[PDB]
Amino acid sequence: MITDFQVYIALMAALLASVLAIRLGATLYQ
Amino acid sequence: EIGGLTKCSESAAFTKRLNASVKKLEQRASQYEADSPPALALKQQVERTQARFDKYSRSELLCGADGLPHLVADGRWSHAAEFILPGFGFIYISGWIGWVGRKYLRAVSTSANPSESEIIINVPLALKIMTTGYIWPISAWQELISNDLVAVSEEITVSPR
Amino acid sequence: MNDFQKYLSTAPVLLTLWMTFTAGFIIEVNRFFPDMLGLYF
Amino acid sequence: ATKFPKFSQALAQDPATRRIWYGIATAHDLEAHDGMTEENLYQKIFASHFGHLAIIFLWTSGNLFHVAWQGNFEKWVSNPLKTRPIAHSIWDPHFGESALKAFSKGNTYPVNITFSGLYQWWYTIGFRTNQELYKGSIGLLLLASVLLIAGWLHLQPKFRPSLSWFKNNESRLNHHLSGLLGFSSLAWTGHLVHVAIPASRGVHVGWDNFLTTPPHPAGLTPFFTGNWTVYAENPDSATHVFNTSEGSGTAILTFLGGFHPQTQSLWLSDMAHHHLAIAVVFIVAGHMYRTNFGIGHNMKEILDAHRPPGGRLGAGHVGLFETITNSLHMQLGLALACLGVATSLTAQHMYALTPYAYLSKDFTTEAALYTHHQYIAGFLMVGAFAHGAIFFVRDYDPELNKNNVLARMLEHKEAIISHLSWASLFLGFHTLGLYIHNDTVVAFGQPEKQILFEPLFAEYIQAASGKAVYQFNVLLASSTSPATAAGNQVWLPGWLEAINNPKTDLFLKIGPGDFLVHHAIALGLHVTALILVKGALDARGSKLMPDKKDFGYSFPCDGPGRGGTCDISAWDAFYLAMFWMLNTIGWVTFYWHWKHMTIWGGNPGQFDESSNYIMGWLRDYLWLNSSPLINGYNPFGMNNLSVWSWMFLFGHLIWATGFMFLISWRGYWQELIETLVWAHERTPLANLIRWRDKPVALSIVQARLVGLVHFSVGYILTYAAFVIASTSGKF
Amino acid sequence: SHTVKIYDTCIGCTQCVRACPTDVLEMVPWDGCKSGQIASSPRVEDCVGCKRCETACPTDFLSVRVYLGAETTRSLGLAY
Amino acid sequence: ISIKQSSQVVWPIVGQEILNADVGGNFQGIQTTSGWFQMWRAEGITSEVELYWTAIGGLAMSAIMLFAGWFHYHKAAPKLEWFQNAESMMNHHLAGLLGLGCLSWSG
Amino acid sequence: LRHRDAIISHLNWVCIFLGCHAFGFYIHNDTMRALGRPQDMFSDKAIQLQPIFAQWIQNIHLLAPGTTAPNALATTSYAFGGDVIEVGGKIAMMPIKLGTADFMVHHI
Amino acid sequence: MAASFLPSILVPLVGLIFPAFSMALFFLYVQTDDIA
Amino acid sequence: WLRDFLWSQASQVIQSYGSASSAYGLIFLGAHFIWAFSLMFLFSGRGYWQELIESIVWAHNKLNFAPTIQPRALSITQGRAVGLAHYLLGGIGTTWAFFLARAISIT
Ligand code: CLA
Ligand code: CLA
Numbered sequence A: 001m002i003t004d005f006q007v008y009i010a011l012m013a014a015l016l017a018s019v020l021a022i023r024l025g026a027t028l029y030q
Numbered sequence B: 001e002i003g004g005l006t007k008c009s010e011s012a013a014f015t016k017r018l019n020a021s022v023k024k025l026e027q028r029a030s031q032y033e034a035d036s037p038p039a040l041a042l043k044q045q046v047e048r049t050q051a052r053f054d055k056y057s058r059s060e061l062l063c064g065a066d067g068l069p070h071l072v073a074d075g076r077w078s079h080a081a082e083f084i085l086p087g088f089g090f091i092y093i094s095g096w097i098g099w100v101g102r103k104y105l106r107a108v109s110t111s112a113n114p115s116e117s118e119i120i121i122n123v124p125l126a127l128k129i130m131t132t133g134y135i136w137p138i139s140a141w142q143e144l145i146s147n148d149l150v151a152v153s154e155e156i157t158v159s160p161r
Numbered sequence C: 001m002n003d004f005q006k007y008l009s010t011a012p013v014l015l016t017l018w019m020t021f022t023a024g025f026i027i028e029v030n031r032f033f034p035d036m037l038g039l040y041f
Numbered sequence D: 001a002t003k004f005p006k007f008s009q010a011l012a013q014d015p016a017t018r019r020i021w022y023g024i025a026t027a028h029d030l031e032a033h034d035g036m037t038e039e040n041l042y043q044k045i046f047a048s049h050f051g052h053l054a055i056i057f058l059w060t061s062g063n064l065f066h067v068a069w070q071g072n073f074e075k076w077v078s079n080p081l082k083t084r085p086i087a088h089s090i091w092d093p094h095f096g097e098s099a100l101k102a103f104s105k106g107n108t109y110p111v112n113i114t115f116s117g118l119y120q121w122w123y124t125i126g127f128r129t130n131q132e133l134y135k136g137s138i139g140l141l142l143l144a145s146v147l148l149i150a151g152w153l154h155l156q157p158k159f160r161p162s163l164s165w166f167k168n169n170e171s172r173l174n175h176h177l178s179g180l181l182g183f184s185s186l187a188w189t190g191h192l193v194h195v196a197i198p199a200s201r202g203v204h205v206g207w208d209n210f211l212t213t214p215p216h217p218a219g220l221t222p223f224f225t226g227n228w229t230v231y232a233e234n235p236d237s238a239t240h241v242f243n244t245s246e247g248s249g250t251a252i253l254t255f256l257g258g259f260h261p262q263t264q265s266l267w268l269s270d271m272a273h274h275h276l277a278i279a280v281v282f283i284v285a286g287h288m289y290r291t292n293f294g295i296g297h298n299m300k301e302i303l304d305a306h307r308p309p310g311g312r313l314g315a316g317h318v319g320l321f322e323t324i325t326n327s328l329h330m331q332l333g334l335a336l337a338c339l340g341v342a343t344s345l346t347a348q349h350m351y352a353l354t355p356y357a358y359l360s361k362d363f364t365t366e367a368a369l370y371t372h373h374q375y376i377a378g379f380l381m382v383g384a385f386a387h388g389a390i391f392f393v394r395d396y397d398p399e400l401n402k403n404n405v406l407a408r409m410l411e412h413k414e415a416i417i418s419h420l421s422w423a424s425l426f427l428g429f430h431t432l433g434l435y436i437h438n439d440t441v442v443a444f445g446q447p448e449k450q451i452l453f454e455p456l457f458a459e460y461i462q463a464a465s466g467k468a469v470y471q472f473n474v475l476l477a478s479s480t481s482p483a484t485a486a487g488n489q490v491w492l493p494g495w496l497e498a499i500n501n502p503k504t505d506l507f508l509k510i511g512p513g514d515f516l517v518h519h520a521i522a523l524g525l526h527v528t529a530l531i532l533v534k535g536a537l538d539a540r541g542s543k544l545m546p547d548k549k550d551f552g553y554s555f556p557c558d559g560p561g562r563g564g565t566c567d568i569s570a571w572d573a574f575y576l577a578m579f580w581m582l583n584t585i586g587w588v589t590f591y592w593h594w595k596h597m598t599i600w601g602g603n604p605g606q607f608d609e610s611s612n613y614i615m616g617w618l619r620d621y622l623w624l625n626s627s628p629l630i631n632g633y634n635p636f637g638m639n640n641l642s643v644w645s646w647m648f649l650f651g652h653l654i655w656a657t658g659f660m661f662l663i664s665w666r667g668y669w670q671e672l673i674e675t676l677v678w679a680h681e682r683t684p685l686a687n688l689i690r691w692r693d694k695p696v697a698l699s700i701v702q703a704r705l706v707g708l709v710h711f712s713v714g715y716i717l718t719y720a721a722f723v724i725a726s727t728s729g730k731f
Numbered sequence E: 001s002h003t004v005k006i007y008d009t010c011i012g013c014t015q016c017v018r019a020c021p022t023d024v025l026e027m028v029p030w031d032g033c034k035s036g037q038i039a040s041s042p043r044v045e046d047c048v049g050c051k052r053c054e055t056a057c058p059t060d061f062l063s064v065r066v067y068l069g070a071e072t073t074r075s076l077g078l079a080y
Numbered sequence F: 001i002s003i004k005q006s007s008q009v010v011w012p013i014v015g016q017e018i019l020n021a022d023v024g025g026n027f028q029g030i031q032t033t034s035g036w037f038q039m040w041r042a043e044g045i046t047s048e049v050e051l052y053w054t055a056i057g058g059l060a061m062s063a064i065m066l067f068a069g070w071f072h073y074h075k076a077a078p079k080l081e082w083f084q085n086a087e088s089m090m091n092h093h094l095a096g097l098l099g100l101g102c103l104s105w106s107g
Numbered sequence G: 001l002r003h004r005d006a007i008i009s010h011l012n013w014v015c016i017f018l019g020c021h022a023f024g025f026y027i028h029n030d031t032m033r034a035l036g037r038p039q040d041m042f043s044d045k046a047i048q049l050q051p052i053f054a055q056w057i058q059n060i061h062l063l064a065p066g067t068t069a070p071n072a073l074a075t076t077s078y079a080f081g082g083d084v085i086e087v088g089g090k091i092a093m094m095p096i097k098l099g100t101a102d103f104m105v106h107h108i
Numbered sequence H: 001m002a003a004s005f006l007p008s009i010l011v012p013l014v015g016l017i018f019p020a021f022s023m024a025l026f027f028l029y030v031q032t033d034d035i036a
Numbered sequence I: 001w002l003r004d005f006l007w008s009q010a011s012q013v014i015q016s017y018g019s020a021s022s023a024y025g026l027i028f029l030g031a032h033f034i035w036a037f038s039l040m041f042l043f044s045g046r047g048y049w050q051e052l053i054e055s056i057v058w059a060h061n062k063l064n065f066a067p068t069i070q071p072r073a074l075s076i077t078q079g080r081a082v083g084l085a086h087y088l089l090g091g092i093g094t095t096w097a098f099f100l101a102r103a104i105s106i107t
């Protein structure tokens, strides 16, 4: 089964992706 | 035979359909007296059903697994009675109608009031022109050769491209 | 009588008469020659 | 540009609620934005493309993560035919206790069952455990981050590509053919030989051991010695149990044909060989154009050289290179057209030539996949024609294309449109007439009077591919044919076993019902094409509006003068053709679903007999199969299909609500909103609050779009609920 | 504000001016036609875009053309 | 109670005679739902001859209405002052049309 | 004509109120039944919406024959109450009872 | 803390908190008179 | 309503083929057809149809014939009127066939 640690790792990677997505969106906005 | 089918005169499902239809009609007929008009009407329906099934049996019609006639329309003459000959009749009739309509419209295009002749038909001219429909293909050929069938593009309006 | 004939010559009256005649002959053909699934007779 | 939307001064100064709506609807039309240059347009599109690819990879990573975390993929792998694959868990505080229990059947917690075919595909490509799926999810999450970074970077001043880079046709085509397609296909072959084939033979090959586990005992010696037949020797036997070593062979490249006997899907060796040959073809193709090394073709020269000497095509293809290069709309139209064809081909080939293990046994998944891909294909085709029309309005230059094929289409648009109209009218008249004749004769209890044309041409095609049922002794159905003697050498035995196997979908048996429904489908295709083609060809102008190009692709009308001009724009042709696309794809999917439901139910004869008249469709397809769907909840309880019952009613409601926008038009609503404004201004304690954007009725075009969106969403949701619920509640 | 253009096919019939509900158009002297006048649209700020002027114009094709553009309170016909 | 009311019969052509339902009473036809039999029985109609006479009178009244329309358009057309007689029209339509109609029907 | 704005604005509001409540009853019920929450529905077996005014009128009409219409021997219509009228084994008319479903449909 | 708690934690954040703040932010952005 | 009223009580109208009620099944279908046909008029506008008619008039002119009564798409108001008339005919006739088949079965 997927461990809690693996889930938390996936969530951290998602957080990174989200900040990069906000950055790209603001950049495209300009 | 063609398409893995069988003749309706050799189809057990076809004959089963005939028997079932006749049986339901006769069950309905059995509720009345023999001389009642409902009984006579039902027995005439029985005769017409039997005549139809027999006519389909004696024909060249093919039958699928369902026991219903299927039509062959790939161009074979052995089944030409199903699409080719009726198609010939339809083309002849429809060409007649269209040719006489076009001829009448073109004839009244030079009348005093062309628009009036479209909503109020000049019946004598119309009947005369309609009687000429039977040679519509020959007339069409002559109109095509004499450059009266097809107009030029320079004479037809178009929109900006 | 000329005016009445011209009224009978109008498009809707003639279409009604012509379609009634055409429907009549189709109906009669099917009354005397019923159930023609192709020209087999 | 001081208020939203900053890309449009005209919209930003509108004082009504319209300003908001239009801003949202014009955000992605970057060509129309204030101060846009061509170079900035290409750069912004490039960055947006990186964003879109990031979204796709996030979606795939999420599917992998939810299956790994909450699915039953290991249980499904251990027992494919008796497990229902899980999509994700449900957590919904609105559920009652009965609902939780109903949605937790076969499990300990409420779940949705997946109908996307992901389990079958992942199983076929070698996935076996939750850990592997989780690793895939993590990789795709990181790749999405990389794509977002790339999108940001290529907007920085030192990394913005120039217009010349975006207009380098030969190099982009070379790389996309040889690298994006050919090398990707080669790498996929490598995956299949190293990973998927061993997995199918009960052998684990992963990142832990792939460097020291050769995919063939003979190694790469045969490949380098040209003794390649060694890779075809010893295929999996007819008794091979998939995922186990019993009956397994060692061939990695084959041309067996047909299906694996147990999975009833394509051989993995056959698919590996397919992708290897594909890789060769595409890598070779990607060397055609001249980039930096002297050799190769120039596309402009190719185009300019192809003019028939007689002159029946006029100037030929001269002018098309600049037209295509300088028009993003024509490029997009070509892309959407080819993608639509490819999506339809995906739908048609996946059901017949099953590529994934056990997929043909998951009936609901089959129906969902076919319907999904056919609807997407319809949307893509409509888009292709819409962007063709946009190209004609915005990008077409008559002088650059003078007397070429593109201009000559415009020159004979009247003949094209009139003949398409004749074809549409002929198909409609005769198909509807035959259906009605059959309906009438069956209603009067005389089914033997039906007109039932046998689809002889298609049956002949099936026979030519080897189908024996129709008694045509032609080509591959003929023992003595040259085609048979040639084909028996490679693939013909397996193909003949599959095609003459009635348990497969390889060339389903057809009859008169198939004939009539196919002519209906042709009607739908021709009418949809007629609307789209007339919209594109009249986009620039018509007799009724000779200067239409000055008004743009989309505009409401030209007023009530000249007899009335509602729905005159090319956008309006797109809008009308959306209805016909939906109707056509509906006919297609109804046909697919009903034929398969009768096959799966063990009674093909019901379709064969009742599909020949409309009442048969209404009664034996829709009415009969509505039953489990409409009983998902009732006065006595609910089951796990209740969500589909609710979605069915939801779709009906959305569709009907779309009718309101489509039928009632703007003036009524604007007058009503005037009284609403009066009421709010005159109501104490509520007039303390005021709008800062004047309420107005939706615009003419906006209402057409909103009605169309409601119609389309309702159509899709209703049919999806029906197909899923009917298939899953029956089987 | 909407755009209203007069093309030189105008015959100075004054019908568009009489049709206008918001007084956008007026007749001005001109030597290009027999009537000695042409239409003009000096007050496009008050044009609602009803296109009654186009409905009234007798030439083929139209001599007055209304192209709808940036919406204002005046062009939206708002009493509020 | 057991016989289904039927007042429309179809001709035997192209198989449509199936529409002549077995409605009872040695009769085949279409089951009609406009309530004619109930109304006729309530009126006291017991024979088809009474129905024939009512139909003949209906034809006579139809011709009379048609002649009256022709007469009051082409031969004797009332002046506008005649039409603007709301008081007299109400008096006649209440007392004569509705009142005498009710009295005679009660008779 | 001089207060058309008031008339139309108030009628518009009445229409929104009626539509939202009357049709939202049905939508609420569909959602509750789908979620496996029958006890949360608007129904006779649940949260009830009894048409008490209609029922009061029905009772009054049922009691009318002897008291407020003393010379009437039976009710004007059996739909208001009374026995079942049977003809040939089929029901001609019997009392038509009004509950929550009748409330919802009358408001529709 | 366990991952099995995440739905009941995350679903209200995704379906209630996030749309409310996103809608408030978009409302504030569309009501702003000078954005650039 | 969708299950216990429409789906359930439509059984008679959809199972009527081959009986005296088959006219009701046919009219049920034809009314559905006319109702759907009305949506073409209700959802579209005459500018499109006039432009299509231009291409068709071209084909007739290309063969040297065309009416002097020039073909025109229906007016805006006539488009609405036709759409609504077919909508009402289709919907009401569908309910008509459905009610009549159901009630003839249950009576
Ligand atoms: C493939 C999807 C896609 C892409 C690549 C784009 C790209 C673009 N959009 Mg579009 N848009 C889209 C979908 C997309 N959009 C959708 C679905 C809508 C709703 C209909 C819109 C509506 C829209 C409007 C109204 C506008 C744009 C604009 C733009 C451009 C400016 C960038 C921007 O908007 O900032 C990106 C947005 C942000 C940075 C804000 C938040 C979004 C980030 C990326 C993710 C959210 C964080 C995450 C959810 C946090 C979770 C928290 C939770 C767990 C608690 C850019 C070209 C603007 C423009 O100027 O056009 C020229 C503009 O005004 N778009
Ligand atoms: C070999 C190196 C290489 C590679 C791997 C790529 C890859 C890519 N580039 Mg390209 N690019 C390259 C070189 C390369 N490029 C060069 C040298 C230039 C400058 C000349 C460009 C200029 C460029 C631009 C301007 C853009 C790209 C974009 C892209 C992306 C396209 C979208 C996508 O992801 O679909 C990948 C799809 C697949 C892997 C599957 C394709 C299958 C399709 C459906 C065809 C299937 C047909 C089938 C095989 C057979 C026909 C069917 C028939 C039987 C009916 C993709 C990542 C776009 C992008 O989105 O960037 C962010 C973009 O806008 N590139």
Ligand code: CLA
Pocket (backbone or CB within 6 Å): D125, D126, D127, D128, D132, D133, D135, D136, D137, D138, D139, D140, D142, D143, D145, D146, D149, D184, D185, D186, D187, D188, D190, D191, D194, D195, D205, D206, D207, D208, D210
């Ligand atoms: C078309 C080419 C192709 C495709 C689509 C696949 C697809 C797959 N392979 Mg296969 N494979 C291939 C070719 C391919 N392979 C080739 C040529 C070989 C050598 C013969 C293999 C050998 C192989 C082995 C041994 C295994 C696989 C496995 C897999 C599966 C899981 C892979 C995975 O973990 O995804 C996640 C994605 C990746 C791992 C790659 C992306 C990694 C990103 C980019 C990392 C980001 C780097 C960056 C520095 C990060 C920091 C920066 C950032 C945070 C900003 C997946 C189905 C595995 C499996 O489970 O099979 C069932 C497995 O064990 N493959």
Ligand code: CLA
Pocket (backbone or CB within 6 Å): D421, D422, D424, D425, D426, D427, D428, D429, D432, D433, D523, D527, D530, D531, D576, D577, D579, D580, I033, I036, I037, I038, I039, I040, I041, I043, I044, I052
């Ligand atoms: C089921 C409803 C329905 C039907 C039957 C039609 C039918 C048609 N559409 Mg329409 N359409 C519809 C819905 C429908 N549409 C909707 C909802 C929209 C979105 C607004 C459209 C938008 C649309 C566009 C944009 C176009 C069409 C076109 C067409 C024609 C296509 C060619 C054809 O099949 O000719 C065959 C004719 C028919 C099938 C209709 C005739 C029906 C019967 C058989 C005729 C019977 C006549 C009867 C005997 C006489 C009356 C009896 C009595 C009253 C006197 C056809 C008339 C196209 C066109 O004009 O092509 C030429 C076209 O460009 N439609």
Ligand code: CLA
Pocket (backbone or CB within 6 Å): F034, F035, F036, F038, F039, F097, F098
């Ligand atoms: C298209 C219009 C139309 C059609 C085709 C029908 C068809 C029918 N009506 Mg209906 N009817 C209509 C409009 C129509 N109605 C309207 C607008 C009203 C309101 C006044 C009625 C009130 C009505 C009554 C009360 C009855 C019918 C009945 C019938 C059926 C028997 C026909 C008959 O001859 O009975 C003849 C009618 C009677 C024998 C009873 C008439 C009693 C009324 C009160 C007479 C009123 C006349 C009066 C002068 C009108 C002026 C009103 C005044 C305020 C100015 C038949 C189905 C009868 C039925 O259902 O039988 C089974 C029936 O009893 N109709």
Ligand code: CLA
Pocket (backbone or CB within 6 Å): D653, D656, D657, D658, D659, D660, D661, D663, D664, D668, G012, G013, G015, G016, G017, G018, G019, G020, G021, G023, G024, G027
């Ligand atoms: C089923 C499709 C449908 C629906 C839902 C509507 C709905 C409406 N129509 Mg429309 N109409 C329709 C078909 C439909 N119509 C069609 C096909 C036409 C063409 C003839 C029209 C032409 C038309 C006209 C001419 C008029 C209307 C008007 C109305 C409104 C009536 C007032 C009202 O009750 O609001 C209440 C809202 C509803 C009844 C809809 C659902 C209510 C829900 C179930 C309860 C409340 C939920 C709440 C908002 C929470 C939402 C949660 C969400 C945020 C997630 C209402 C919004 C009228 C109007 O605006 O009057 C003020 C009006 O004059 N319509």
Ligand code: CLA
Pocket (backbone or CB within 6 Å): A007, A010, A011, A014, D055, D058, D059, D060, D061, D062, D063, D065, D066, D088, D089, D090, D091, D137, D141, H006, H007, H008, H010, H011, H012, H014
């Ligand atoms: C884009 C694909 C995608 C989709 C549609 C979903 C959908 C869902 N997730 Mg999942 N999730 C995903 C990817 C996705 N997830 C990935 C890659 C991870 C690993 C980080 C997770 C980790 C995760 C957890 C731990 C949980 C969910 C849960 C859920 C459910 C409730 C929403 C929620 O609260 O999640 C919260 C989601 C996050 C905190 C991380 C989101 C990460 C993805 C990549 C965001 C995607 C952004 C998207 C592409 C933007 C475009 C959409 C927009 C234009 C419309 C819902 C079914 C909950 C659940 O299962 O309830 C039963 C839950 O507890 N997800």
Ligand SMILES: CC1=C(C/C=C(\C)CCC[C@H](C)CCC[C@H](C)CCCC(C)C)C(=O)c2ccccc2C1=O
Pocket (backbone or CB within 6 Å): I040, I041, I042, I044, I045, I046, I049, I050, I072, I073, I074, I075, I076, I078, I079, I080
């Ligand atoms: C289809 C359609 C048309 C095209 C339909 C037209 C022009 C009607 C054609 C009617 C025919 C020509 C009259 C009846 C004739 C028969 C159909 C064929 C007999 C031919 C001759 C005997 C006259 C519109 O003009 C239109 C206008 C505004 C909103 C919606 C629509 C709309 O939906």
Ligand code: SF4
Pocket (backbone or CB within 6 Å): E004, E019, E020, E021, E022, E023, E024, E025, E046, E047, E048, E049, E050, E051, E052, E053, E054, E066
């Ligand atoms: S569009 Fe209307 S308001 Fe504008 S100039 Fe013409 S008539 Fe006047």
Ligand code: SF4
Pocket (backbone or CB within 6 Å): E006, E009, E010, E011, E012, E013, E014, E015, E016, E017, E038, E039, E053, E056, E057, E058, E059, E063, E064
């Ligand atoms: S623009 Fe047209 S209507 Fe106005 S004056 Fe000129 S010709 Fe007359």
